[PDB]
């Protein structure tokens with residue numbers, strides 16, 4: 216299918232639209248990153264909420280890696296306030312944290328381990344109706360959590376997923392002023408996450424014309440604008456910001472692929488968006504070598520960028536990575552350590568449900584060989 | 594903003610998904626075109642509904658030009674059956690008819706003249722909550738009514754509009770088998786409607802990146818595939834079918850423009866999609882002459898099609914019209930008659946609320962001159 220729950224508000228100054236969006240709600244809770252507080256954006260959001268006649272309470276300074284345990288720490292405060300509207304302001308992790316909070320707040324009867332999943336050998340129960348409106352306000356460009364029905368967080372040190380349309384945000388507000396405060400490396404990494412989301416969404420087994428429309432526009436936009444953006448160009452930051460959400464609309468519908476999976480299993484090495492960028496060329500090469508469908512799809516993307524072939528697309532991504540100063544795997548982690556982890560990462564990758572949507576189903580050995588090839592870095 | 598209420602089901606054989614979609618509903622009413630009945634598609638839809646355990650009742654053979662009076666004729670039968678789900682199967686007009694039925698069925702207390710509008714001097718009341726689920730199944734490619742919140746119909750011989758998210762369909766099913774039965778001229782005209790919707794949506798004052806993504810994909814698809822489709826190529830018919838809905842998603846959000854308005858005011862001359870095709874080159878020329886914004890936007894579309902300039906885009910559309918055998922205005926209607934109607938059409942165009950979204954606000958005289966220029970046909 217193709218669907219989109221979230222209503223998207225976008226444009227310069229569009230944070231102020233929060234006043235209109237909270238109309239009819241009296242008690243607004245905002246979870247925000249430390250950076251949203253420091254830059255004064257949290258106080259602006261609070262001001263916009265109070266303009267509309269609501270009371271507001273904010274919890275700022277959330278851990279970068281969300282966890283059930285930390286959410287359980289402030290859940291009592293949330294229940295004491297009793298919001299009828301939730302706002303997430305910050306990166307993907309802040310949105311993920313707020314999505315999980317929504318589940319716990321709206322359905323306190325649920326057992327976490329019964330509704331979340333670790334991998335394809337989990338069997339989660341479906342989440343029931345979750346009534347509290349959720350507004351997502353991304354400050355990075357970006358993970359696309361502001362339109363997805365997915366959240367990732369730890370419990371007991373282990374990484375879990377929750378996926379349901381019940382936590383896809385009702386509203387996303389895309390005000391490019393917020394991502395203009397990303398430091399350069401965050402702009403680079405989150406930008407490359409957009410590119411990899413787009414390219415993977417375009418080549419899954421369940422891509423539609425409708426998801427493709429969004430994936431192709433996101434890819435073109437990042438390709439043209441990300442380097443200017445990383446160096447602080449104000450318009451480029453806006454263009455890439457909207458592109459991040461486009462890629463989110465794409466992968467919400469088309470899912471993601473082997474690159475996202477391998478990147479997540481290698482997260483100990485460094486930032487997702489960066490590891491995605493490093494692995495993508497190798498994933499594209501692998502997929503094209505084993506699937507004429509994938510090769511043809513990569514060539515279609517190449518033609519949208521002004522080239523011809525799958526090979527061109529792989530070379531374009533590699534050169535963009537260099538332009539943006541993305542390191543080789545070798546420069547992030549030493550051979551001994553990598554080789555010691557490669558087996559478990561390849562198995563955990565193989566155990567990821569996303570593999571089913573990749574245009575090729577890889578064997579654990581192939582994935583292991585793939586990790587090793589990316590490490591050798593040629 | 595950007596939003597999409599409708600969930601889109603698309604693909605070969607996807608009419609059978611109706612069984613899944615009627616789950617939880619016991620009484621399904623289907624409004625269908627004569628052609629849907631004759632080709633056996635109505636009986637298939639009925640079969641799919643009965644599979645799911647529901648009862649079904651169908652009203653087939655709807656007038657091509659919907660009217661309140663004709664809807665009021667079969668409303669008693671509808672109320673007697675008491676559907677909890679409505680299905681529209683056919684062209685844009687069948688979907689429009691079913692949307693209006695939904696209003697009358699769900700909110701029988703409303704006065705038609707108080708909630709519908711004729712032009713910008715109307716002041717309609719907002720439509721309240723309309724609860725009955727609506728599934729739209731287009732057989733042409735197409736008007737985009739399957740994703741819009743709009744309906745057009747006559748009352749007392751006068752053309753009215755109803756626009757509310759309450760009549761945007763809950764679900765659209767896009768099964769390319771249905772539009773493969775369009776005759777060639779209907780495939781041509783509805784196809785050119787897609788192209789004009791896309792180009793207008795791309796150049797309104799409220800276009801966003803998100804609507805653009807859909808508009809650009811629709812434009813490219815029609816340009817590449819419509820001529821093959823009109824001659825009966827099965828894959829081309831599928832590609833253009835999905836493109837029609839993309840253009841609908843675009844104009845749902847970005848609105849339409851001077852071409853749609855002038856075409857509707859000249860409907861006495863012939864089929865909408867065709868009149869749209871004839872007028873577009875002249876509208877694009879006008880808009881580009883008065884707006885550097887429009888000119889630049891037309892050049893962006895040109896570059897997506899493999900060219901450079903606004904002038905290129907105007908020449909591309911003109912040559913596509915010739916390839917498809919679209920006539921000159923002169924060959925549809927004689928000069929005396931045209932000149933006698935030109936004043937009222939230009940005034941009624943000027944009185945259309947859509948004019949506000951066109952990148953240029955034209956004067957009644959300019960619109961009159963524009964109609965005359967298109968008639969001279971150079």
Ligand SMILES: Nc1ncnc2c1ncn2[C@@H]1O[C@H](COP(=O)(O)OP(=O)(O)O)[C@@H](O)[C@H]1OP(=O)(O)O
Nearest residue numbers: 248249250306307308309354355358393396397401
């Ligand atoms: N607009 C912004 N200004 C400054 N720093 C920002 C920022 N957006 C994100 N960051 C930083 O960039 C990092 C990435 O945040 P994240 O982990 O949510 O990213 P992602 O969106 O990929 O999930 C964080 O360390 C964040 O700092 P805070 O936790 O203190 O907010």
Ligand SMILES: Nc1ncnc2c1ncn2[C@@H]1O[C@H](COP(=O)(O)OP(=O)(O)O)[C@@H](O)[C@H]1OP(=O)(O)O
Nearest residue numbers: 626627628684685686687732733736771774775779
């Ligand atoms: N799939 C199909 N097979 C045959 N004729 C079709 C068709 N789809 C549309 N048409 C015809 O094409 C014409 C256009 O229908 P319409 O007015 O709903 O078009 P639109 O979609 O532009 O609103 C109608 O005369 C219709 O014939 P019926 O009214 O008898 O159905």
